Task: structure prediction
Amino acid sequence: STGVELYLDLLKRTVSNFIYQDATHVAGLITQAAFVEEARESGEDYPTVAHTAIGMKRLNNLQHCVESALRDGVPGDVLETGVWRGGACIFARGILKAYDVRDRTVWVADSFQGFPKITDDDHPMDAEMNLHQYNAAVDLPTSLATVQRNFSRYGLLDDQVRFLPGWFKDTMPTAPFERLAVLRMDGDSYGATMDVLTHAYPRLSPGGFAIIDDYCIPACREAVHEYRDRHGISDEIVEIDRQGVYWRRS
Amino acid sequence: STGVELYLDLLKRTVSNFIYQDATHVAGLITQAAFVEEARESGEDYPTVAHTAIGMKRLNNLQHCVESALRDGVPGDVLETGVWRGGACIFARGILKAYDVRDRTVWVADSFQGFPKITDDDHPMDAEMNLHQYNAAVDLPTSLATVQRNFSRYGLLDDQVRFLPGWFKDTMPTAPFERLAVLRMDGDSYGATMDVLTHAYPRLSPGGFAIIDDYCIPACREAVHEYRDRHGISDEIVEIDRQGVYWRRS
Ligand SMILES: CC[C@H]1OC(=O)/C=C/[C@H](C)[C@@H](O[C@@H]2O[C@H](C)C[C@H](N(C)C)[C@H]2O)[C@@H](C)C[C@@H](C)C(=O)/C=C/C=C/[C@@H]1CO[C@@H]1O[C@H](C)[C@@H](O)[C@@H](O)[C@H]1O
Ligand SMILES: CC[C@H]1OC(=O)/C=C/[C@H](C)[C@@H](O[C@@H]2O[C@H](C)C[C@H](N(C)C)[C@H]2O)[C@@H](C)C[C@@H](C)C(=O)/C=C/C=C/[C@@H]1CO[C@@H]1O[C@H](C)[C@@H](O)[C@@H](O)[C@H]1O
Ligand SMILES: Nc1ncnc2c1ncn2[C@@H]1O[C@H](CSCC[C@H](N)C(=O)O)[C@@H](O)[C@H]1O
Ligand SMILES: Nc1ncnc2c1ncn2[C@@H]1O[C@H](CSCC[C@H](N)C(=O)O)[C@@H](O)[C@H]1O
Ligand SMILES: [Mg+2]
Ligand SMILES: [Mg+2]
Result:
């Protein structure tokens, strides 16, 4: 175990709070508050304190994607769309820091207000799901200032972390990045997924990775397949855990 | 910058819980529960959750002592007497892990049940202080099993961590280590300090470090000076923060 391996291993345990094992909110299928190791390992609970909810398997996937991009010389930045308390983005910045990468940026995109209120412009599956109803229940609204504060606690708030506050339909089309090596999508809805695929995926480098955190949600999956069909994308969809999948852009 | 530096920096922030900033118990001179950065930085509060109470300055000192011993080839193990939830010993094991040191052990010595009830054999200053009164108030009693669990959460429970459960007057004289490079004393009382100086200090290598966590406590200081006078020890006492001091054995 090298210094780098030890740091990144600890960083994953810390952002997911395997260290102190905070209770989960009781919501959805989670019926008790107790920390359950298997649930945190696969990112299935709603941490009361942890900086990410994606779990160890999806953190490991993020590491694999970033390391592979670095190893293979895939150009570009890392973007996460849907960051909550920022833990996955903190981890991404940590990976770059561990390898002393100074020429890539972690872009942190969120409304910083939780899920949007549904209107008649929403896809019917998003309207039915109405994720907005869960904002308070899982402490989803997390301000930009809080996310910045969280980065600073790890010593990782610096000029290689850039923030894109706003709804993805507004921020993605003109987001100032030129190229992405990893595009990590974690907005849950058809709308958020389609917004980001439409406006950010064209900037994903060949050899880069597209991660769909919420593929288990029918609305999200619907967007993925509609987008891939439209663009003739046949790159293998690889399952990570019970929620997430990814593909590598050929 | 380097992987090692990043890992050890993160490990300090984690064991002291600068990451999630848990409340303090309201006790002693601490009059409110809120996390205060300055108090955790100098190890002056009573963390509700964090694995160590010693704070960042004393964690930095422990790192300095261990790194200096390794750098200078000072032979021996690391012993902490008075470990609470184990965070300072977890950090010590992490330092050895970071440098891939396989030939030194971290010894973890505690009653694993908090301060002892005062008896007629106790030093009058210890009787007056009666540290036993605080056990439950600051959650001091922490079992061996809990401490082992805590090490495991960092991936640092292995055969280079050895436990010495019991009162120091019982465990120290025949503790199986031969040599120490760092002796970290954090038992607060005249009795605990004198027990450990008497029975462990003779095994501290020349060039090794003796850390007195609780030098601000009159009873502890009394023991330190009595011991040093008895043995003709004049090695400079160097202040770390508002509580701790150390010297290097010449
Ligand atoms: C609490 C927040 C959460 O809400 C739930 O989990 C709600 C679960 C419903 C209650 C389920 O319905 C029940 O199924 C029973 C089996 C039979 C029930 N009935 C018929 C008796 C029926 O009522 C769902 C199956 C409904 C479908 C539409 C669905 O998938 C909805 C997804 C909702 C996801 C939100 C956001 O969480 C995101 O999750 C991502 C995965 C994470 O990565 C992360 O990003 C996170 O932020
Ligand atoms: C809560 C637990 C704690 O209790 C206290 O802190 C009690 C503080 C008293 C209230 C103080 O009195 C006040 O002084 C004011 C200056 C004027 C006040 N008054 C007359 C106006 C007077 O009332 C003390 C100074 C009294 C002296 C005998 C002393 O030092 C006692 C030490 C007690 C330490 C325990 C164990 O905590 C350990 O501390 C280590 C240092 C840590 O590293 C760590 O190991 C930890 O576990
Ligand atoms: N259309 C939209 N535009 C911008 N942000 C959105 C959005 N829909 C959802 N979000 C945001 O998407 C996030 C979903 S949760 C993200 C989890 C996070 N990746 C983690 O590591 O735990 C929330 O922060 C929410 O505010
Ligand atoms: N005589 C004695 N023998 C063994 N353990 C003792 C003792 N007197 C006090 N202790 C133990 O000394 C510890 C004091 S607190 C130690 C704090 C710890 N170093 C940290 O990193 O935060 C407690 O765990 C208590 O159980
Ligand atoms: Mg998700
Ligand atoms: Mg102390």
Summary: Residues 1-250 of chain B form one domain.
